[PDB]
Symmetry: C3
C-alpha cells in the first residue's frame, strides 16, 4: 500500500529531480510532511503495473502522452483546481492534460527537441538534412562527426519521419482515428530511409543511445545533436560554445517534432491526494518552485504565466518554441504507448538492417492500430 | 457583418498598435486565430456608426469616457470576468469600465497629461502658467518658443480650464447632474482667457495641432510641451534631453487633467466574444502582453498589478501619477461626447478670435446640457 | 467613534511604518481616501481597551498570537477573501490567522529571531551558548562584550528557554491543553538558569532593553545580538560588517524561537471594512506594497508568493528561515497574553535576583494556567 502522511514522487532521470527534492524539503519545513523524490528506471512502464495493485508513488511525472492511457486504466485521480489556479497557467497546456472531459494531471512545461550545434566547429548550422552527408565528409577528415543523437528512442527520429508527411493518428472532426496510422506513408518511409542511408554511408551509428550522443557533443567529437531543454545543463558544464536552433528541413519541409508537456499526475490509490494537490498548486507551480527545478535541469517553456518573462527572452527557449510550432503536441489517447512501442521496434530494426525500412514501417502501422 | 473565426482590433494611432499586433501573432501561434490590428482615423466617431449596423471591429480600444455612451447605444457586449481575473487588476480601474452596474470593457492603463520640457533649453521648468509669457520672450531672442501643444483637442486645454474651477458635470450624492455644467464659470473663463491671451501676445499659435507641437519639441524648436505617455517613444528617437514633470499651476491652483483609462470593449455584434475574452484576459492582460504594447508606445500606469514593478519606478510614470492625482478620472456617462464636442468648438473659436471666450464658453454650456 | 470615509492604521514602532504610509499615500492617489499610519506605545495592550468601546484604528498590525484573544473579545471583523486572493498567500500563514474556524486577520510576513554578529569582531560566531562566557572574557580584554539583547521582553529569552524542554501549552490531538504549561520543566529551568548565570558572571546586564542592545551592536560595543528582520535597517545605516546566522545551541539542542506572523486585523467597530479590505488585498498584499514596507524595515519571509524571489536568495532571510524551522509558530489562543505576561515577570525577577529561577518559573506556570 501507499504510506499515508507522506509524499512519494517519481520523475525521469534526465529531469531536475534534485531541484524538485529542494521544493519537497521547502514543503516539509512548512507542513512537516516528508517528500521522497525517486527516479526509477523505465518508470512510464513501471507505474501502471504498481498503480493497478494500489501501490506506487503519490505523484507521477511524465509527458502528457502516457497520461490518457493511465486515466483510461483507472490509475489517475481527477485533479480539482479552482478557476483561480487554472488561470495561473496557459489554457493550451490544460487541454493537453484533459482526457474524457476530465483534468488528469498538472501541466508543468512545454518540452521540444531542437538543433543543438557547436558554434566553433560549425558557425552556420545546416538549413537542410540533405546537406548533412557532405558536411560529415568535411568533419570526418578532421576526425569529427557532423551529427549524433539517440537512435534507441523513436521520439528523436520522429521530426525527421514526420517532416515530409509521416504521422501518428489522423486528426479530423475534433478526434483521432485510431485505425488511421501514418507511419507507413511515402513521407514516413522517405524520412526513415534518409536516416538509414546516413548509417549506411558511415555518417551515423545504429548503436548510438542517449548518453553516447551527449558525450560526443559535450566532448566536442560531434558538431551537432538533437535534444530537449533538459540537456542544456551538461552542455554548460562542458564549456562548449553551443547554439540552440530550428531543426533542419527535409524535402523543403520543416522537421515536425512531437511536442510533450511535462505533467504531474496523482495516483488514484493515494491516501494523500489533498497533500499532493497542496504541494503541486502551492509549492511547485510557483515562480520559486519552477526556479528550483529549472536551475537543476531546464524545463523548457513553462505553463506558469508568472514565470514566462524569466525564460521568454532566452534564445534557447525561443528556438525551442519555434520547433514546437513547426512540430505537433502529442495526443494523450491510450493508443500512444502502442504507437511508440511499434515505432521503437521499426526504427531499431531498420537502423540495424535486421528488416527493410518498408517491411519494418509496415509492421509498425499494423501494430500501432487496433 | 463581422467575420467569425477571426479577431479585428481597432486602436488609436498614437498607441502601441504594432506591439499589440505581436500579442495577436503570439495568440495566433497558440490558437490558430488571425488577429488583425487596425488604426482608423476618427475611430471614436467611426465605431458607433458601424457597430449600430452589426459591422465594425471585434474589439475597440479607447479611453473609458466614450464607453458608457456606446453601452447605452447597445453596441458593447457585457464582459464576463471571474473574480480571479478581476482581482488581477486595480478595482478603481474596474469602476471606470462600469456602466449601469455592468462591466462593459477591460481596463488597460491609466493615462494623464504631463508637462514635458527640454532639459538643455530649460533646466528649471516653470512651476506656474503666469510665468510662461516672460519665459517665451527670453526664448524668442534665442529663436525658440517656450511652449507648444495641440490646441485642436480640448483634452490638452482642459487641465488649464479646470484649474481655477471648470468642470464637466457636477458630481453629488453618487451621481452626475447632466443639466449642471461648469464650462461657463469664473474658473473656466479665467483659464481659457489666459490661453487666448498667450495666442494674442504672440506666445502661442491657435493653428498648432498635435504633430506641429510633436515636431517643434522633438526638433528642439520649443522648450516645453503638454502630452501623455504614448508621446515618449518619438522623444526618445529624437535624442532630446527631456524631463516629464507636474503641469504648471494657475492662480496658485493645480492643473486638473481629465484622467483616461485605456479600455478594451467587445462589439455586441461580434460572433467571436469568447475568443475576444480569451485574447484580452490570457494574452494582453499579462506581463508579457503589456510589455509588448508598452515597448512600442508607453501605456502609462497599468491596471495589472503584476506588471507595476516594471514601470512604477520610472520618474516619468511618477509625474504621470502626480498629474493624475491632481486631476480627475473622466465620467463614462453618454453626455461626454456632447461635452467634448461643445468644448472643442468653444476652444477653437475662442483661440481663432471667431468668438469671445465668454460667448463661446456660454454656447458650450448650453450645448453640453440636455 | 471611528471616522467614516478614512483609514487609521496602528503598527509597531520597530516596523516599516513610513513604508506603509507611502502605500497609504498611493491608495489615496487612486481612491481619494486619507490613510493615517500611527505607532502608539504599548499598542497590543492599548487596542483591546479602545476597540471594546467602539473606538481605535480601522486596521491593527501585530503578530498573530494576540489576534485569537481579540477575536474571542469580539474586537475583530471576519475577513472575507475569495479563494483567488487566498491562493496569493501560503496556506500555513492562513492557518495562523484562523481562530474558531474564522479568518480573523491578513498574514503579511513570517518573522523569527536569529543570531546577528559583527564579522570584524567575530569571524566565526559561536555554534553553542556554552562557549559564550569564554568568548566574552576575550572581548572584555578588547574593551567589548560578546552578546547583548533585550532582557525586558520574554520573546528574546524564549528560544533559550524552549531549547532543552520549555513550552507554552501542550499540543496533542489537534488542540492546546490550556492547563498543561511547560515553563516550569527541567528544560525551561536549565535555559533561564544559563541566562541568569551569564548576568551573575558579569557577561550580561539585567537592565538591558531593545535600544540599549541596538545601540551597543550598531556602535560596535558588542560582538553579537539577538533580533528579527526589522532590525537590519539600522545595522545597515551603522555600516557594521554584520552577518545573520542560526542561533547558538544549548545542551546540543537548537534554540527554539517562537515564530510570529505579522498580521493585519480589521476592527469590528470600523465603518470602513470594505475600504480596509481594498487597501489590504489590492495595495499592501502586492509586490509593490511589500517592497515599500520592506525597503523601510525588512519584513522577513513574506506570506505573498509573487514576492518570494525578491527576498528568497538573501542569506539573512535563509538564516531567518533556518531558525524559524528550528522554532515553533506561536498559538493564537486567548491565553497567549496570560503566558507572555507570566514569563515576562519570571524572566525579569530571575535576572534581577528578586526571585530564584525555580521560584519565578513556578509562579509563571501557575499564572499562565487558568
Ligand atoms: O521515445 C518514446 C517516448 O517518447 C517520448 O519520450 C521522451 C519524453 O517525452 C522526453 O521528455 C524525454 O524524457 O525523453 C523521452 C525520449 O527518450 C514520450 O513522451 C514517451 O511517452 C514515449 O514512450
Ligand atoms: O480631446 C477630446 C477627447 O479627450 C480624450 O481623448 C484623448 C485620448 O484619451 C488619449 O488616449 C489620447 O490619444 O488623446 C486623445 C485626445 O485627442 C477623451 O478620451 C475623448 O473621448 C475626447 O473626445
Ligand atoms: O515578548 C513578549 C511578546 O513577544 C512577541 O512580540 C514580538 C512581536 O511579535 C514582534 O513583531 C516584534 O516587534 O517584537 C515583539 C517583542 O516585543 C509576541 O508577538 C507578543 O504578543 C508578546 O507579548
Ligand atoms: Cl504575479
Ligand atoms: Zn518579458
Ligand atoms: Zn517595485
Ligand atoms: Zn527565486
Amino acid at each position: 500500500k501507499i504510506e499515508e502522511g507522506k509524499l512519494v514522487i517519481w520523475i525521469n532521470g534526465d529531469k531536475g529531480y534534485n531541484g524538485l527534492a529542494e521544493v519537497g524539503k521547502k514543503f516539509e519545513k512548512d507542513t512537516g510532511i516528508k517528500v521522497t523524490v525517486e527516479h526509477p528506471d523505465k518508470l512510464e512502464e513501471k507505474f501502471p503495473q504498481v498503480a493497478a495493485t494500489g501501490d506506487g508513488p503519490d505523484i507521477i511525472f511524465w509527458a502528457h502522452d502516457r497520461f490518457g492511457g493511465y486515466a483510461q486504466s483507472g490509475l489517475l485521480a481527477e485533479i480539482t483546481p479552482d478557476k483561480a489556479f487554472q488561470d495561473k497557467l496557459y489554457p493550451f497546456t490544460w487541454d493537453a492534460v484533459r482526457y474524457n472531459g476530465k483534468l488528469i494531471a498538472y501541466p508543468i512545461a512545454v518540452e521540444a527537441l531542437s538543433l543543438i550545434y557547436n558554434k566553433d566547429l560549425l558557425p552556420n548550422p545546416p538549413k537542410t538534412w540533405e546537406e548533412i552527408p557532405a558536411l560529415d565528409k568535411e568533419l570526418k577528415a578532421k576526425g569529427k562527426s557532423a551529427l549524433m543523437f539517440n537512435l534507441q528512442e523513436p521520439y528523436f527520429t520522429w521530426p525527421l519521419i514526420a517532416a515530409d508527411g509521416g504521422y501518428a493518428f489522423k486528426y479530423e472532426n475534433g478526434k483521432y482515428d485510431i485505425k488511421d496510422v501514418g507511419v507507413d506513408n511515402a513521407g514516413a518511409k522517405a524520412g526513415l530511409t534518409f536516416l538509414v542511408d546516413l548509417i549506411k554511408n558511415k555518417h551515423m551509428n545504429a548503436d548510438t543511445d542517449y548518453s553516447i550522443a551527449e558525450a560526443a557533443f559535450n566532448k566536442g567529437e560531434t558538431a551537432m545533436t538533437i535534444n530537449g531543454p533538459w540537456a542544456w545543463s551538461n552542455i554548460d558544464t562542458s564549456k562548449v560554445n553551443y547554439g540552440v536552433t530550428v531543426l533542419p528541413t527535409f524535402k523543403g519541409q520543416p522537421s515536425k517534432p512531437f511536442v510533450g508537456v511535462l505533467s504531474a499526475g496523482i495516483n488514484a490509490a493515494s491516501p494523500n491526494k489533498e497533500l499532493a494537490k497542496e504541494f503541486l498548486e502551492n509549492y511547485l507551480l510557483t515562480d520559486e518552485g519552477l526556479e528550483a527545478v529549472n536551475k537543476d535541469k531546464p524545463l523548457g517553456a513553462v505553463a506558469l504565466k508568472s514565470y514566462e518573462h524569466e525564460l521568454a527572452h532566452d534564445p534557447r527557449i525561443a528556438a525551442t518554441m519555434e520547433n514546437a510550432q513547426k512540430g505537433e503536441i502529442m495526443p494523450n489517447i491510450p493508443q500512444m504507448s502502442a504507437f511508440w512501442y511499434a515505432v521503437r521496434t521499426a526504427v531499431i530494426n531498420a537502423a540495424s538492417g535486421r528488416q527493410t525500412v518498408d517491411a519494418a514501417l509496415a509492421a509498425a502501422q499494423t501494430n500501432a492500430a487496433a
